[PDB]
């Protein structure tokens, strides 16, 4: 029925025993560390987004400043 | 139970339609819909499920009839009679399954047409709360109908009495399956 | 030092330190020629403190040597290929007998093979 | 364990197979067995070579039909032997050949 | 102890009374392990061990809702840029409160 | 469109407008206009007056809930056995506390709604969400951990549903008729009515 | 005030508690496994290391 | 068209008159004959008739049936994949259920009436409730999930159809109607949101696939998920374009979130069918978003990528079903050494897994290129978002392949002659579409 | 011998499995491994992430020192002792078009300013 | 043997909790009589109620639903005590 739970000890002398076990607790990253690393790596992934945002803001600000100077020049003149 | 849960309603619907017995209040039909659906979902016994389904549907039909849609309620009461005939006079599982599908409002059978009449009348009066409640309560009642299908074919072996007196039961099941396409003009 | 090394008796603990030190001499060398003088030097390093009887000093030496052997663990251990951690370990492992093979599979109840919907 | 009856139909261990290596002989794989060397391999290789050359002929016809040279080569090219759509060579100075 | 069930000739019969175990499709079934089965049961029914904690709320919000908020903001910015690019008037999007009715560009119009 | 080459749907010109044309020649309405009492209760100008007008609904609901529970207790007590304790001393706290706490929740809701609308100066979804959030916060003062989140959300969601299906829904579909010609499309040749259908009279119950 | 909140089955507490004893997979043994968290240490230039490795003539 | 509809009606009809021992053979012949009738419908469909290739009506608005680009592709796909389902399923009960389901689904695709579409599509509601909740190998929870989700979404769609029939007077697609109402747009949208598994309404699909039979899973993945795009191109975009353009940032939010979280949820799977089922959910989002752009590229790319999915995911589900028959296990951790033990099964499994990862010689590549091009036409960032997070699919696919590939195993579990006959058509179709015969 | 070498079989599981046991990759041969080496368990060389970060902190200033001088401290006039390659006007005008060209740094040219602004071009497409 | 859900609580304690539902059961006509009478009079009074805003109506319905006690809850917890 079920597979046997008894291990094979034929090759222990050749390749070492299985007594030594892992020290891992099999638990994940802490919530606080995860928040920092998500909110750091995900922006790095979305590097085009920030480039587009920067250039669009630059374009709009230059356009608005041109408009303001145009208003100043067209008011007096 | 079958004859006195369907036949009396027709006279009351006719009296309401002809003698202008309508109220502006929608609380009672809304309460009927929600209470019927929730109590049907929470009821263990099969008779209570079928009894609460009628409360919910008659509340919705009352909301439709107050607004003057007499034709649709007069069709609904007949389609409901035919749909309830098979589940109440339970002799065969398959007939009861089609009847329960028809009561749910399920598309291949005539019960879909009858529920569709009432729902179509609802969107005309344009009361949003009623429509939202109708959708959610219909889902809740559908869970109970699914309980009824589960009990017959998916829980345990089922053995019933061989009461071979299906006078109009076979005709009613035939009418539920067949009648959808001739009556499609109504909706 | 790992837990298994700590649980060991004193005699075996010093033996482990000598064995690990020799293996790490092998790993950090560039050839067999480097090994012999360094092996003799490790020999003398252990022989110098063997006659101490003060337990506290001996504990100090063992702990310091264990820290030194922990720091100088090689990134690349020199392991024979056929053993665990070796390149040829598991390349084509010898396949065992008593394998469950089903002969003429498609001709066992050929017409009626498929999934059925059973109902109550 | 007494070998099953179908073992007679199965083939032996090849010369290239290491004597220690054991594999299940019943498993079928399109690329071949664990060490192959079938009987009649020479004829199969000859047939494969014939198919390769026939397909090469068909591909050669297709490519020659679809090989378009729109710029003249600087010098004589081997394609002139087999394809007639090669433009006449012109050298670096510009003289036609 | 075993016998060949399948017959290519078509003369196949299932020997339910045979002393020898047939080599049917169940011959190759994986033996299975008790603890692996309980691990499978635990992993599927992980909703039993769900607990509402401030850490759980923090994780759910910061990752799921955070990603939704970031995606919505990025999509809104892209829509604004495209409206500036195309020359369209600012479009009346659902949650944007705009005093313009421009929704679908007229194909016939030149923008 | 039903093709893979050009976009589906269509577009309407913003410059071109179509003159409104009446759905029928003579309009007879069976829908009554809002009463003066409804406009009085809906008035949120004075937050105290708005609160005091709309609380009787909440007090009524609390009284029915308390009466239900108190009758469930009364039904159980045995008439045949004489009871040392006084039943009304047992039952009155039930009804009184249910009614009081219901009235308090409704008062917070109405007061916060009116105060936010006055301060904002605009009728918006946000007033209902904030009043509901405050009411749900009062509901979950000392309650365990999921409930500080869930009740503000549910109580805020309720006015959103009320606004969406009680005000926005009717106003969005006023024009649609169902008889004669479609509201957008009058150019199409459909039977045009002299009078609108009256399916029922104005109600009076 | 008796309310639905009192009788709703809120997920405050785990219905199922995992078993305490857990399987740790077998791993090849590293005798000395203490972590080096200091790039600059006295251990690199320790007198023993100098005598064992750097000093002997090759 | 008429021949196709007649054959679709003939298949359930034949079961009533067959001997109950000839049922499998008659069903297979009927399925192949329906496939041939679909080929005839393609032959009689002239591309000169640009709007609709064919329209037939049988006396009422409900009986109006027609084929367009999307409808024709989806109908040919279902008629192609049905015979494989027929051979995989044994028993008169199962044959009856699957034939009725296929008849209803195939009638839904060609329907041009929203109410008739609703009536035919939801007729297969109990049939899946019974199918997924079958006695020994079914789960009642999954059947409840799928049935309730479908009922609520379809009822919302039905309410929107009633409002359209009241206002316009018609609900047929061939009559041009436009609406700007958001309530009706959401009523039509919710069905698409649920049927095409889109977070957070995707929970029904996994439980259904795992606890459905292999033929049932093949149909579900192959064509029932595609019914969403027939509804979108036929019954939502023509009338509800203003609302999709109004809500486009929200639509992108939901679609890209579905893609990302479905990809991450796939990583936590130990069951092979669940892995394939979650891959399907991540794949649906690109289709939904590409169509929602309402551009020539988007519609074509979505229908193409639907065809690619309906050729790749049925193959993976079929291979997993074959492996489960051979091994009685679906846990990846139990299955090891499959490369050595099943070289022929492993080759096809790797081929189809490469197809699911959208490698160039597969139809998924061409389809993805077109869809990404449409997204790039809308905005660059839209395409960039989808392209990057495609790497998550590679991680879980590679982990599954690595776990299955090697190890120690004492069982020869390789496919028989029947199994190879079952997937040969899918492999041939995948190759033919991959070289560009989309 | 490449083929037929002895191997050790990993022991069967005999204790309740952790929830995140999917982090362990075991094919049945004894030395099972984490899904990504270094995620947990023994560290190669017994070196933690802190050690590697400190080593990188030591390296980066020395590695970056050659690059920072030319890119930042130096200027086009003083970077090199010569001007960029001189071309005929027809060739130079075409070559100056390339944003990634090498004639954009010709400070002798009277179009130096425009060429430099061309070199520092747009981050993203405007349309 | 198969993996099974862990059942919180002890068997006898859970059975004792369940046994607190086995109490003298009143007949439902007593509740129904009062509900019918007060409901008839209530429907008569409702036609005279002032028109309320939809928002207030929904909040009142929510409060009533939250405040409603299921008849089984009183059944289990009823004590004939001060
Ligand atoms: C002295 C006499 C004693 C009585 C005093 C009063 C006398 C009557 C006077 C006037 C009576 C007319 C008006 C009363 C209400 C009409 C009901 C009625 O008469 O039916 C007969 C009924 C008995 O009939 P039955 O068939 O024997 O019992 C069926 C049940 O199965 C019974 O079995 P059960 O109790 O074991 O099971 C109860 C079950 C039954 O189900 C129901 O109760 C259905 C009620 C649903 C709402 C009803 C429709 C609401 C529409 C109101 C319309 C007005 C506003 C308009 C706009 C609103 C838009 C919605 O519900 C529950 O399980 C408990 C929950 C209760 C509400 C469920 C909804 C919860 C939503 C909240 C969500 C928040 C949770 C989030 C977090 C969740 C975490 C996951 O008698 C009464 O119950 C009357 C008691 C009066 C107390 C009501 C208190 C408030 C009333 C107004 C508020 C409206 C909300 C309704 C609350 C619940 C009312 C039942
Ligand atoms: C446009 C049509 C669509 C609209 C639908 C509504 C209109 C209905 C039109 C068709 C109505 C058909 C009704 C079919 C009823 C089925 C006949 C029937 O019930 O016969 C019974 C009658 O049972 C009786 O009780 C007999 C007593 C009455 C006999 C008939 C009386 C006839 C009265 C004259 C009616 C003429 C009409 C008068 C003028 C209009 C016999 O069955 P059982 O023996 O009781 O049990 C059957 C057992 N088993 C099937 C399982 C084998
Ligand atoms: C168990 C399996 C065992 C059997 C294995 C079978 C081995 C298969 C052999 C591989 C075939 C490789 C051929 C690839 C070319 C694709 C063939 C093809 O598409 O036919 C073309 C004709 O083109 C050719 O014949 C190509 C010539 C093939 C030989 C050329 C040299 C062979 C080198 C292979 C390099 C091909 C790289 C192409 C990458 C896409 C059809 O022409 P049209 O009429 O224009 O069709 C319309 C185009 N479309 C298909 C997109 C709709
Ligand atoms: C900052 C990133 C900038 C560079 C990005 C390129 C590399 C990114 C990370 C590369 C991970 C791919 C490596 C891999 O496949 O991992 C495992 C495969 O196992 C896994 O599946 C682990 C999953 C890792 C893949 C994804 C993790 C990294 C994601 C990057 C960002 C995370 C979130 C970002 C937004 C989604 C195999 O590694 P080993 O155990 O060392 O095997 C090597 C052979 N030998 C045994 C001899 C040592
Ligand atoms: C309870 C549940 C919620 C609780 C937890 C929520 C916590 C999350 C909050 C932070 C979320 C990320 C930041 C996005 C929102 C920023 C604030 C919104 C306001 C805003 O739109 O500003 C824009 C942000 O830039 C942008 O356009 C977005 C930049 C950030 C997106 C890229 C970073 C992650 C990349 C990962 C991929 C995700 C996106 C894939 C497409 C730039 O202002 P404006 O110039 O646009 O003018 C628009 C006028 N306000
Ligand atoms: C069935 C809908 C119920 C909502 C379900 C949401 C999830 C429930 C969680 C409870 C949270 C409370 C409910 C909040 C939902 C409203 C959305 C917030 C958006 C928002 O804040 O903008 C408001 C308008 O949106 C609005 O308030 C109207 C938007 C309508 C809600 C979204 C409708 C579609 C959602 C359906 C999702 C799938 C259904 C499954 C539940 C402000 O507007 P403003 O005018 O006040 O301007 C401000 C001038 N002061
Ligand atoms: C004006 C009105 C104001 C709003 C008032 C709202 C009041 C509540 C309305 C809720 C209506 C939704 C109805 C669905 C209820 C959830 C399903 C019931 C839960 C349940 O236990 O069902 C079990 C299995 O269901 C399952 O396994 C299904 C899992 C859950 C189904 C997912 C729900 C569908 C998707 C939800 C949103 C879809 C889009 C919404 C626009 C079977 O129970 P049993 O048969 O054994 O009976 C034994 C009785 N305990
Ligand atoms: C919170 C995020 C939103 C979640 C949705 C995500 C994306 C879904 C988009 C689907 C695309 C087409 C759907 C049309 C609109 C649906 C929701 C759009 C967002 C929304 O709620 O906008 C509201 C308007 O829509 C409305 O007033 C109606 C909202 C939908 C009603 C919900 C249930 C309806 C069910 C009806 C059944 C069929 C009935 C047919 C008669 C309020 O926005 P606003 O313009 O007022 O701006 C005020 C802000 N300050
Ligand atoms: C030549 C071109 C450049 C080549 C690559 C250069 C990369 C330089 C980045 C490293 C230099 C700056 C490091 C930040 C200063 C930290 C110094 C102390 C480190 C520390 O205390 O915490 C560490 C954090 O990891 C960290 O320090 C991770 C920060 C790394 C930032 C991401 C940059 C990519 C790095 C990829 C290669 C670098 C490998 C070494 C970092 C170890 O953390 P713990 O595990 O002990 O935490 C405990 C688990 N609860």
Which DSSP string corresponds to H210-223?
HHS-HHHHHHIIII
The answer to whether the CB of C40 falls within 8 A of the CB of G58 is no
Cβ within 8 Å of residue E56, ≥6 positions away: E50
Residues of chain I in contact with residue G27, where contact means CB-CB under 8 angstroms, are: 31-32, 41-42
Which helix (H) or strand (E) covers residue H57, if one does?
strand H54-57
Distance, CA of E109 to CA of H362 (rounded, Å): 42
Is any Cβ of chain I less than 8 angstroms from the Cβ of H406?
Answer: yes
Distance, CA of I65 to CA of H69 (rounded, Å): 63
Q: How far apart are the first and last CA of chain C?
A: 65
Which structure tokens are listed for H121?
A: 């599509």
Q: F203 vs B67: CB contact, 8 Å cut-off?
A: no
Task: Tell me how far CA of residue H156 lies from CA of B60, B141, F167, H118, H161, in angstroms.
Answer: 17, 15, 20, 11, 9
Pocket of ligand 5 (CB under 6 A): A 42-43, 45-46, 49, 53; E 61-62, 65-66, 69-71, 73-74, 77; H 381, 385
The answer to whether the CB of F154 falls within 8 A of the CB of J62 is yes
Distance, CA of B112 to CA of H407 (rounded, Å): 56
Distance, CA of C113 to CA of H215 (rounded, Å): 13
Distance, CA of H72 to CA of D66 (rounded, Å): 35
Q: Tell me which residue of H382, H431, H392, H408 sits closest to H275, measured CA to CA.
A: H392
Angle at CA H163, nearest 5°, toward B62 and H177?
165
Task: Tell me how far CA of residue E54 lies from CA of E68, F40, F146, F177, in angstroms.
Answer: 20, 45, 9, 52
Task: Tell me how far CA of residue I2 lies from CA of B148, C94, D88, in angstroms.
Answer: 65, 10, 59
Which helix (H) or strand (E) covers residue H55, if one does?
strand H54-57
Which structure tokens are listed for B49?
A: 């499920």
Neighbours of chain B (3+ CB pairs under 8 A): C, F, H, J
Q: Is the CB of I66 under 6 A from ligand 9?
A: no
Nearest to F145 among E52, E106, E107 (CB): E52
Distance, CA of H339 to CA of H337 (rounded, Å): 5
Handedness of CA I94, I98, I100, I106 (dihedral sign): positive
- This structure's resolution (Å) is 3.1
Q: Tell me which residue of H3, H8, H6 sits closest to H42, measured CA to CA.
A: H3
Distance, CA of H305 to CA of H294 (rounded, Å): 16
Phi, psi for F162 (deg, rounded to 5): -65, -45
Q: What is the 8-class DSSP label of residue H67?
A: E
The tally of CA atoms less than 13 A away on the side-chain side of residue H55 is 16
Cβ within 8 Å of residue F157, ≥6 positions away: F132
Torsion angle, CA of J6/J12/J13/J19, rounded to 10 degrees? 120
Torsion angle, CA of B119/B125/B130/B136, rounded to 10 degrees? 30
Q: Tell me which residue of G21, C72, J48 sits closest to F60, measured CA to CA.
A: J48
The answer to whether the CB of F168 falls within 8 A of the CB of E94 is no
The answer to whether the CB of H121 falls within 8 A of the CB of H154 is yes
Say if residue J55 is exposed, middle or buried (CB neighbours under 10 Å; 0-12, 13-18, 19+). buried
> Tokens 């549907």 — which residue?
B57
Task: Tell me how far CA of residue F167 lies from CA of C6, H285, I37, in angstroms.
Answer: 77, 34, 60
The answer to whether the CB of I17 falls within 8 A of the CB of G22 is yes
Distance, CA of B53 to CA of B38 (rounded, Å): 10
> Tokens 């929904």 — which residue?
J58
Cβ within 8 Å of residue F147, ≥6 positions away: F139, F140, G5, G10
Q: Is the CB of H395 under 6 A from ligand 4?
A: yes
Q: Tell me which residue of H148, H170, H149 sits closest to H161, measured CA to CA.
A: H170
Q: Which ligand is nearest to the CA of A33?
A: 9
Angle at CA H330, nearest 5°, toward H327 and H333?
95
**β partners of residue I33:** I25
**β partners of residue H271:** H331
Residue in D with minimal Cα distance to H344: D29
Computed on alpha carbons and rounded to an integer, the radius of gyration of chain C in Å comes to 28
Pocket of ligand 6 (CB under 6 A): E 95; F 120, 122, 124-126, 153, 156-157, 160, 164
Which structure tokens are listed for I31?
A: 């030395």
Contacts 24+ apart (CB under 8 A), F177-183: F177/F23, F177/H167, F178/B124, F178/H166, F178/H167, F178/H169, F179/F23, F180/F23, F180/F24, F181/F23, F182/H167, F182/H168, F182/H169, F182/H177, F183/F23, F183/H167
Q: What is the 8-class DSSP label of residue I38?
A: T
The answer to whether the CB of F174 falls within 8 A of the CB of F168 is no
Distance, CA of H417 to CA of H411 (rounded, Å): 18
Question: How many residues in chain G?
Answer: 58
Which structure tokens are listed for G14?
A: 């785990």
SS3 state at I47: strand
Distance, CA of B88 to CA of H124 (rounded, Å): 25
Torsion angle, CA of E109/E111/F5/F7, rounded to 10 degrees? -70
Phi, psi for H293 (deg, rounded to 5): -65, -20
Distance, CA of F120 to CA of A4 (rounded, Å): 73
In the reported structure, the alpha carbon of residue B171 is separated from the centroid of ligand 2 by a whole-number distance in angstroms of: 9
The answer to whether the CB of H311 falls within 8 A of the CB of H318 is no
Residue in E with minimal Cα distance to G17: E49
Q: How far apart are the first and last CA of chain B?
A: 30
Is any Cβ of chain E less than 8 angstroms from the Cβ of G23?
Answer: yes
Handedness of CA D4, D5, D8, D10 (dihedral sign): negative
Distance, CA of F95 to CA of F73 (rounded, Å): 11
Task: Tell me how far CA of residue I36 lies from CA of C77, H399, J5, in angstroms.
Answer: 19, 11, 33
Is any Cβ of chain I less than 8 angstroms from the Cβ of G56?
Answer: no
Which structure tokens are listed for C18?
A: 């000598």
In the reported structure, the alpha carbon of residue H169 is separated from the centroid of ligand 8 by a whole-number distance in angstroms of: 24
- Number of helices (H) and strands (E) in chain C: give both, helices first: 4, 0
The tally of CA atoms less than 13 A away on the side-chain side of residue A55 is 14
Distance, CA of H104 to CA of H99 (rounded, Å): 9
Distance, CA of F5 to CA of F11 (rounded, Å): 16
The shortest C-alpha distance from G21 to chain I (Å) reads 6
The answer to whether the CB of H198 falls within 8 A of the CB of H285 is yes
Task: Tell me how far CA of residue H261 lies from CA of D4, H312, I77, in angstroms.
Answer: 52, 22, 54
Q: What kind of experiment solved this structure?
A: cryo-EM
SS3 state at J64: helix
The answer to whether the CB of B10 falls within 8 A of the CB of B115 is no
SS3 state at H28: helix
Angle at CA H185, nearest 5°, toward H181 and H187?
120
- Quickly count: other Cβ atoms within 10 Å of residue F93's Cβ: 12
> Tokens 């919505």 — which residue?
E72
Phi, psi for E32 (deg, rounded to 5): 85, 155
The tally of CA atoms less than 13 A away on the side-chain side of residue H405 is 10
Task: Provide the greatest CA pair distance for chain E.
Answer: 88
The answer to whether the CB of F68 falls within 8 A of the CB of J42 is no
Q: What is the 8-class DSSP label of residue B156?
A: S
Task: Tell me how far CA of residue A35 lies from CA of A38, A40, A47, B68, B80, in angstroms.
Answer: 5, 8, 19, 60, 58
Helix H segments across B90-127?
A: 93-104, 110-125
The answer to whether the CB of B102 falls within 8 A of the CB of B111 is yes
SS3 state at E2: strand
Contacts 24+ apart (CB under 8 A), A59-65: A59/I126
Q: Is the CB of A45 under 6 A from ligand 4?
A: yes
Which structure tokens are listed for A63?
A: 């356009």
Q: Could you tell me how far CA C94 lies from the centroid of its own chain? A: 22
Cβ within 8 Å of residue H71, ≥6 positions away: H109, H110, H230, H234
**β partners of residue H67:** H54
The answer to whether the CB of B187 falls within 8 A of the CB of H115 is yes
Nearest to G1 among F97, F146, F147 (CB): F97
**β partners of residue H54:** H67
Torsion angle, CA of I51/I53/I57/I60, rounded to 10 degrees? 120
Handedness of CA H378, H382, H384, H387 (dihedral sign): negative
Q: Which ligand is nearest to the CA of A29?
A: 9
SS3 state at E21: strand
SS3 state at H356: helix
The answer to whether the CB of F98 falls within 8 A of the CB of F62 is yes
The answer to whether the CB of C97 falls within 8 A of the CB of B131 is no
Q: Where are the beta strands (DSSP E) in C29-104?
A: none
Residue nearest to atom 6 of ligand 9 (CA): I56
Q: Tell me which residue of B26, B29, B105 sits closest to B60, measured CA to CA.
A: B29
Computed on alpha carbons and rounded to an integer, the radius of gyration of chain I in Å comes to 29
């Amino acid at each position: 029925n079920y597979a046997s739970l008894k291990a094979d000890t034929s090759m222990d002398h050749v390749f070492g025993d299985s007594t030594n076990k892992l020290n891992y607790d099999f638990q994940l990253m802490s919530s606080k560390e995860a928040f920092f690393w998500n909110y750091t790596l995900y922006p790095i992934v979305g590097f085009p987004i920030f480039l587009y945002l920067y250039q669009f803001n630059k374009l709009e600000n230059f356009e608005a400043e041109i408009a303001a100077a145009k208003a100043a020049k067209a008011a007096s003149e | 139970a079958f004859v006195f849960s369907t036949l009396p309603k027709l006279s009351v619907l006719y009296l309401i339609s002809n003698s202008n017995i309508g109220s502006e209040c929608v609380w009672w039909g809304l309460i009927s819909l929600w209470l019927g659906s929730i109590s049907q979902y929470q009821s263990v016994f099969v008779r209570s499920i079928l009894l609460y389904s009628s409360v919910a549907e008659i509340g919705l039909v009352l909301l439709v009839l107050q607004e003057g849609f007499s034709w649709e309620a007069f069709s609904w009461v007949s389609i409901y009679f035919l749909s309830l005939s098979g589940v109440w006079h339970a002799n065969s599982k398959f007939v009861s399954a089609i009847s329960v599908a028809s009561i749910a409002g399920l598309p291949p059978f005539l019960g879909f047409i009858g529920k569709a009449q009432i729902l179509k009348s609802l969107v005309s009066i344009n009361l949003g709360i009623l429509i939202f409640s109708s959708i959610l309560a219909a889902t809740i009642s559908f869970i109970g109908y699914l309980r009824l299908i589960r009990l017959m074919y998916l829980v345990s072996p089922v053995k019933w009495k061989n009461n071979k007196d299906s006078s109009f039961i076979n005709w009613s099941t035939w009418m539920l399956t067949v009648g959808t396409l001739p009556m499609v003009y109504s909706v | 030092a790992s837990e298994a090394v700590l649980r060991l008796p004193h005699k075996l603990r010093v033996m482990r330190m000598y064995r690990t030190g020799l293996k790490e001499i092998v790993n950090w060398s560039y050839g067999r020629h480097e090994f012999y003088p360094r092996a003799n030097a490790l020999r003398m390093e252990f022989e110098a403190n063997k006659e101490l009887s003060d337990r506290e000093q001996i504990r100090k030496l063992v702990l310091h040597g264990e820290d030194l052997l922990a720091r100088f663990r090689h990134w690349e251990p020199t392991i024979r290929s056929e053993f665990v951690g070796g390149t040829v370990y598991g390349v084509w492992p010898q396949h065992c007998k008593d394998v469950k093979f089903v002969p003429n599979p498609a001709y066992i109840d050929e017409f009626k093979q498929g999934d059925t919907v059973l109902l109550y | 364990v007494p070998e099953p009856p179908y073992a007679k139909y199965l083939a032996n261990k090849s010369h290239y197979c290491p004597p220690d290596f054991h594999y299940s002989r019943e498993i079928y794989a399109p690329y071949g067995g664990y060490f192959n060397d079938p009987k009649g391999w020479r004829t199969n290789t000859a047939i494969a070579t014939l198919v390769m050359l026939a397909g090469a002929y068909a591909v050669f016809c297709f490519g020659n039909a679809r090989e378009e040279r729109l710029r003249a080569p600087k010098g004589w090219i081997p394609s002139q032997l087999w394809n007639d759509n090669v433009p006449t060579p012109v050298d670096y100075r510009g003289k036609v050949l | 102890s075993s016998r060949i069930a399948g017959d290519t000739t078509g003369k196949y019969t299932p020997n339910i009374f045979s002393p020898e175990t047939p080599m049917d499709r169940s011959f190759s079934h994986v033996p299975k392990n008790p603890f692996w089965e309980a691990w499978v049961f635990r992993r599927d029914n992980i909703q039993r061990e769900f607990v509402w904690t401030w850490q759980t709320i923090f994780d759910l919000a910061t990752f799921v809702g955070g990603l939704y908020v970031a995606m919505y903001a990025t999509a809104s910015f892209c829509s604004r840029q495209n409206d500036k690019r195309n020359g369209y008037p600012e479009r009346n999007y659902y949650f944007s409160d705009s005093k313009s009715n421009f929704v679908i560009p007229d194909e016939r119009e030149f923008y | 469109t039903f093709n893979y080459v050009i976009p589906y749907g269509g577009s309407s010109s913003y410059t071109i407008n179509n003159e409104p044309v009446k759905a029928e020649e003579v309009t007879v309405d069976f829908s009554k206009e809002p009463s003066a009492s409804s406009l009085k209760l809906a008035d949120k100008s004075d937050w105290i007056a708005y609160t005091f007008n709309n609380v009787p609904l909440m007090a009524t609901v609390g009284l029915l809930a308390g009466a239900h529970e108190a009758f469930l207790h009364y039904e159980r007590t045995p008439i045949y056995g004489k009871r040392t304790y006084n039943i009304i001393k047992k039952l009155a706290p039930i009804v009184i506390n249910k009614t009081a706490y219901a009235t308090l929740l409704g008062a917070i809701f109405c007061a916060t709604d009116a105060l936010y609308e006055n301060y904002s100066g605009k009728k918006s979804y946000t007033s209902g969400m904030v009043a509901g959030a405050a009411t749900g916060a009062v509901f979950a003062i000392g309650r365990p951990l999921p409930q500080p989140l869930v009740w503000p959300l549910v109580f805020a969601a309720a006015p959103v549903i009320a606004d969406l299906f009680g005000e926005v829904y009717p106003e969005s579909m006023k024009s649609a008729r169902g008889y004669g010609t479609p509201y957008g499309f009058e150019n199409l040749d459909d039977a045009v009515p002299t009078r609108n259908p009256i399916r029922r009279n104005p109600h009076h119950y | 005030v008796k309310t639905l909140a009192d009788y709703i089955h809120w997920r405050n507490k785990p219905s199922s508690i995992p078993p305490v004893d857990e399987y740790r997979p077998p791993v090849p043994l590293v005798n000395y496994d203490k972590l080096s968290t200091q790039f600059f240490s006295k251990l690199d230039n320790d007198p023993v290391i100098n005598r064992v490795l750097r000093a002997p003539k090759v | 068209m008429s021949l196709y509809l007649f054959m679709l009606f003939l298949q359930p009809l034949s079961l009533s008159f067959v001997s109950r021992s000839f049922s499998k053979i008659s069903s297979l012949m009927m399925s192949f004959a329906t496939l041939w009738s679909a080929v005839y419908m393609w032959f009689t469909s002239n591309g000169a008739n640009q709007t609709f290739y064919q329209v037939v009506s049988w006396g009422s608005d409900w009986s109006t049936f027609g084929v367009c680009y999307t409808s024709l592709y989806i109908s040919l796909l279902c008629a192609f994949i049905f015979p494989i389902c027929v051979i995989l399923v044994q028993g008169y009960r199962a044959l009856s259920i699957l034939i009725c389901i296929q008849t209803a689904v195939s009638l839904s695709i060609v329907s041009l009436h929203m109410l008739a579409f609703y009536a035919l599509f939801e007729s297969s509601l109990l049939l899946f409730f019974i199918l997924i909740g079958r006695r020994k190998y079914g789960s009642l929870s999954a059947a409840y999930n799928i049935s309730i989700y479908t009922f609520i979404s379809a009822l919302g769609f039905l309410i929107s159809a009633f409002w359209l029939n009241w206002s316009f007077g018609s609900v047929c697609a061939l009559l041009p109607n436009e609406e700007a109402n958001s309530f009706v747009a959401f009523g039509i949208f919710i069905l698409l949101w649920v049927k095409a598994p889109l977070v957070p309404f995707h929970l029904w699909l996994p439980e259904a696939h795992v606890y459905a039979p292999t033929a049932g899973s093949v149909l579900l993945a192959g064509v029932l998920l595609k019914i969403s795009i027939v509804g979108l191109h036929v019954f939502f975009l023509p009338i509800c374009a203003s609302s999709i353009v109004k809500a486009f940032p929200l639509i992108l939010s939901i679609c890209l979130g579905s893609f990302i979280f479905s990809s991450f949820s796939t990583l936590k799977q130990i069951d092979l069918k669940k892995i394939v089922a979650y891959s399907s959910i991540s794949h649906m989002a690109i289709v939904f978003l590409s169509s929602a752009t309402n551009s020539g590229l988007g519609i074509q790319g979505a229908v193409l990528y639907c065809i690619a999915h309906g050729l790749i995911s049925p193959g993976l589900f079929l291979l997993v079903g074959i492996l489960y028959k051979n091994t009685n296990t679906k846990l990846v951790f139990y299955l090891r050494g499959l490369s050595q033990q099943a070289p022929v099964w492993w080759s096809v499994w790797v081929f189809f897994m490469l197809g699911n990862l959208a490698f160039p010689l597969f139809p998924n590549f061409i389809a993805e290129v077109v869809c990404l091009s449409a997204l790039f036409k809308n905005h660059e960032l839209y395409a960039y978002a989808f392209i990057f997070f495609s790497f998550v699919g590679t991680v879980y696919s590679s982990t599954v392949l690595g776990r299955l590939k090697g190890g120690v195993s004492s069982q020869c579990v390789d496919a028989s002659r029947l199994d190879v006959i079952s997937w040969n058509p899918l492999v041939l179709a995948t190759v033919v579409t991959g070289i560009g015969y989309m | 011998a490449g083929a037929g070498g002895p191997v050790k079989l990993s022991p069967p599981v005999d204790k309740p499995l952790p929830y995140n046991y999917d982090f362990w990759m075991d094919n049945g041969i004894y030395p099972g491994q984490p899904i990504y080496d270094g995620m947990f368990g023994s560290m190669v060389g017994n070196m933690s992430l802190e050690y590697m970060a400190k080593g990188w902190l030591v390296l980066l200033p020395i590695l970056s020192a050659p690059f920072v001088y030319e890119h930042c401290i130096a200027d086009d006039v003083t970077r090199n002792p010569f001007v960029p390659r001189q071309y005929p006007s027809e060739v130079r005008e075409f070559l100056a078009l390339f944003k990634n060209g090498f004639v954009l740094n010709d400070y002798s040219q009277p179009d130096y300013e425009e060429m430099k602004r061309r070199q520092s071009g747009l981050l993203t497409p405007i349309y | 043997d198969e993996p099974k859900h862990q059942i919180p609580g002890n068997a006898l304690d859970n059975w004792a909790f369940l046994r607190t539902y086995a109490k003298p059961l009143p007949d439902m006509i007593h509740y129904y009589y009062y509900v019918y009478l007060f409901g008839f009079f209530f429907v008569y009074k409702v036609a005279d109620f002032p028109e309320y805003s939809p928002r207030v109506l929904v909040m009142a319905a929510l409060i009533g639903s939250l405040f409603y006690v299921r008849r089984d809850w009183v059944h289990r917890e009823f004590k004939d005590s001060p």
